[PDB]
Amino acid sequence: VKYCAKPVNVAKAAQARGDNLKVHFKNTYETADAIRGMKVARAQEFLKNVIIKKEIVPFRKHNGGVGRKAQCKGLNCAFGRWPVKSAQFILKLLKNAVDNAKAKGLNTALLTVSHIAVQEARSSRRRLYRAHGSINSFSSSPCHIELILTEKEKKVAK
Amino acid sequence: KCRLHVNAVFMGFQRAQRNQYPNVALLQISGVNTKEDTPFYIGKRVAYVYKVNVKKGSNKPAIRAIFGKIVAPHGNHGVVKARFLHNLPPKAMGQNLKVFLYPSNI
Amino acid sequence: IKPKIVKKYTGHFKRFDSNRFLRVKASWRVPRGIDNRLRRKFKGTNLLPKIGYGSAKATRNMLPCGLYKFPVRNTTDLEMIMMQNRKYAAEISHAVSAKKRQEIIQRAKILNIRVLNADARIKKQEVAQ
Amino acid sequence: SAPQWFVPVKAGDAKVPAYYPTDDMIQEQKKKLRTRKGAKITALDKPAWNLEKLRKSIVPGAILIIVAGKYAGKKVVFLKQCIKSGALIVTGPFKINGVPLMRINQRYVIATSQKVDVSKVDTTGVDVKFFKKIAIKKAAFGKTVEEDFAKKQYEAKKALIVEKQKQVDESIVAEIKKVPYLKEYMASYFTLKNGDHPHLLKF
RNA sequence: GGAAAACUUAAAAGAACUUUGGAAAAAGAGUGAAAAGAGCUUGAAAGAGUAAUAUGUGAACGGAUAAUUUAUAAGAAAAAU
RNA sequence: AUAAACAUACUUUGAAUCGGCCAAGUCUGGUAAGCAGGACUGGCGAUGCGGGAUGAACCGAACGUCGAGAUAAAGUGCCAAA
RNA sequence: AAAAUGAAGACAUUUUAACGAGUAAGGAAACGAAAUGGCGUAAGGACAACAAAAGUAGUAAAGAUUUAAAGUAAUUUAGAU
């Protein structure tokens, strides 16, 4: 699986990726949407609070039946949850990407989450035994995750 | 500097109850309350001058114009028919149109 | 010298209901339905191809430059329109290589024949050259 | 000889067929695009075939109102008609209105009833030569670049002749001051006030 | 009673060593003409994700006419006696 | 009298169709029916356009793509051109 | 429809006049003044650089995605990846 975008300056960016991750796409797509653009130092602190249920992940698009919370004030969204499994999976990729920046030799404090995308993977089917001799499907929803962290420096365009 | 035009109101195109012909635009010249005061204006120039908020780096003019001529009366209440180079934008209904004094036959 | 080419309808005649369904393509098909809105020429939807839209015979199939089209595959194809260079224009076929395209373009300049693919399949001489 | 459709061109040492002539016997011809002859020049005293018929209200010495163009709203004095172009030759005497000697088509003016008359205007010059002499022309196409400065120098060199022909204004200026309130009337812009309906105004 | 399932490359040369990780893997490095990377010739539509741009009071979409923005896109000749 | 030469007379081969519906200075059964059934014509079906707010049949008028002008039914306080 | 011209031009000739709504249905091919005109898919037989190297193709085929042009339309053409 290839990356959606390529960095403008490869020498100042680092990448991490996961393929066929056993985590719900609908939940992870919202978690990655929350931390897009925030600094790596800040992002790791947001994801830990989602684990201990102190910061919300607004479910902007997949909000069917999702209950309202008190931490969803100001985000223009009335619904949010605390997906722990999806937050942990991102936390392992952010650490992997950061260790790539250290190998390259970039300054950690200047890295932001410039690009992060989630794609739908191939599902695995199972059996659910129903009334009157019917069998249905019990399908996982895995996903691919890409992450590109770039050093943030001031730009000028005259 | 001076006022060399008479304001006319772009009421709307030549139309019927359920149709519309944007080739001809109807105008209400100020002070013309009857069709017998129309023969003076038949043939005078008419301009729809509008303003466009252009960006600093664009060389397009900030004041553009569409010109046209008054061709015939329309009804007994001093309403005229004007045909322009390009049909007037329907967003300009109720705006003012400069009715000049040339081609002068005085 | 070049006449005024007048097109009676510059838009596209799109198939009915093609804007609502992705299975119905936009290539025109006359609706034969017994209750069809378009084939009964209802107000609002009465736009069907007719012979009346045909452009003038004099200025038909004429490119905007004022000439016609004459596809060429080699240099010898150009020799068929050297007496009519004021009437035709060479149009190199899409499969002709870049090596052969230079020979056609070089010869067509000799014979004073316009080529409409003069900047086709050109080399990478756009940056750093 | 050569076919009427055959216009030989030089081959840049490229591959040419056996029937095509070589470079040594090909002499290139300049592309010719101008096929229509320009206008003829006739005697300065005779009128052009393309002469408009002026309105009966427009007579020499009458005062006209310019209702279009750069000098819109100004008042001028009509001396005579340019026979070679059909445009009126007016002067809103420069000491009064600042309108110089110029040419204006009769469709952009209104003939007022006020008339300055004035004979002996001394129009010995001020013909189609004079107006073509003081016109500011562009910098052609192939004349190097000559950006910006070309027009600034043109006004300086043509300024002297412009003043020289303002000896015409010496007569109307004196007469205009004879009529009370006329000098104020001439120097002031023409305006359409409240209740000034053009179909009711009369001049 | 009774199916489905064809294709890497010319050649496996099928990455092989380091860092992060419990591991799978990822980032480098390398092979190859080209990753074509084994879910391997090309890679469409339906469905998503990212980026750019635009719009908004109980449907949406289409047509005619203009305005705005963007794009395409027409020339090197040359006057009178 | 009027009209009629892309007039007139056809010949051969064959398609589809024979559930029909409407109007009326018309009729029969019925208390009557947007009911049932007929005589003559015109329509809808197979037909859009302008008008009757909306309407298969009513009124004007039947359609190649367009520009300008007089018009038809019918309209002219605003929606809506007058 | 009628006149005129006619071995090859070309736009299926030139001129004049009338005409052009439509369900079911019909108008097979060919027919120089053509007894309707055409577009598209695949396969077979020929034609395709006329001076002895004769359609395009690793100086990039088919396919795919788009940008523009031609055609009333069916569709065709070319650029970029």
Contact in structure between D136 and D151 (CB atoms under 8 Å)? yes
- CA-wise closest residue to A116 among A142, A150, A84: A150
What is the residue type of B38?
A: T
What is the residue type of B98?
A: K
- CA-wise closest residue to D191 among D74, D96, D64, D69: D74
Structure tokens at A108: 């950690």
Per the rule left: phi > 0, alpha: psi between -120 and 50, beta: everything else, D146 is left
DSSP string for D96-112: II---SEEE-GGGEEEE
First to last CA, chain A: 38
Three-state DSSP class for residue D193: coil
Work out the angle at residue D33's Cα, subtended by the Cα atoms of residues D28 and D36, and round it to the nearest 5 degrees.
Answer: 135
Structure tokens at D48: 């052009």
The number of C-beta contacts closer than 8 angstroms across B and D is 52
Residues 6 or more apart whose CB falls under 8 angstroms from that of D17 comprise none
Three-state DSSP class for residue B79: strand
H helix runs in chain C, sequence order:
75-78, 98-110
Beta strands A13-21; A143-151: pairing state: antiparallel
Method used to determine the 3D structure: cryo-EM
User: For residue D171, what is the enclosing H or E element?
Assistant: helix D169-176
- CA-wise closest residue to C73 among C99, C98, C95, C106: C95
Cα(D22)–Cα(C15) distance, rounded to whole angstroms? Answer: 57
Interface of D with C in 20-59 (CB under 8 A): 20
Contact in structure between A131 and A106 (CB atoms under 8 Å)? no
Work out the angle at residue B36's Cα, subtended by the Cα atoms of residues B35 and B42, and round it to the nearest 5 degrees.
Answer: 75
DSSP string for A60-105: SS--SSPPB-TT-TTTT-SBEE--HHHHHHHHHHHHHHHHHHHHHT
Residues of chain D found within 8 Å of residue C88, distances taken between Cβ atoms: none
Beta strands A13-21; A57-58: pairing state: unpaired
Structure tokens at C66: 């004022």
Structure tokens at B82: 């004007």
DSSP string for A116-133: EEEEE------EEE-GGG
Strands (E), chain C: 70-72, 90-92
Cα(D57)–Cα(D110) distance, rounded to whole angstroms? Answer: 9
- CA-wise closest residue to D117 among D174, D162, D74: D174
Cα(C10)–Cα(C64) distance, rounded to whole angstroms? Answer: 14
Give the closest of D55, D110, D111 to B101, CB-based. D110
Work out the angle at residue D127's Cα, subtended by the Cα atoms of residues D122 and D132, and round it to the nearest 5 degrees.
Answer: 140
Three-state DSSP class for residue D198: coil
Cα(D179)–Cα(C107) distance, rounded to whole angstroms? Answer: 81
Q: Which residues pair with A39 in a beta bridge?
A: A112
User: For residue A137, what is the enclosing H or E element?
Assistant: strand A135-137
CA distance B31 to chain D (A): 6
Handedness of CA B14, B20, B22, B23 (dihedral sign): negative
Beta strands D75-81; D88-91: pairing state: antiparallel
- Amino acid A110 CA to nucleotide E53 C1' distance, rounded Å: 30
Contact in structure between C15 and C29 (CB atoms under 8 Å)? yes
Overall resolution, Å: 3.0
Cα(D180)–Cα(D192) distance, rounded to whole angstroms? Answer: 23
Structure tokens at D59: 């007579």
Contact in structure between C87 and C113 (CB atoms under 8 Å)? no
CA distance B17 to chain D (A): 32
- CA-wise closest residue to D20 among C109, C42, C57: C109
Residue appearing with tokens 């000559």: D146
Contact in structure between A97 and A106 (CB atoms under 8 Å)? no
Inter-chain CB proximity C112 and D7 less than 8 Å: yes
What one-character DSSP code corresponds to residue C63? Answer: -
What one-character DSSP code corresponds to residue B62? Answer: S
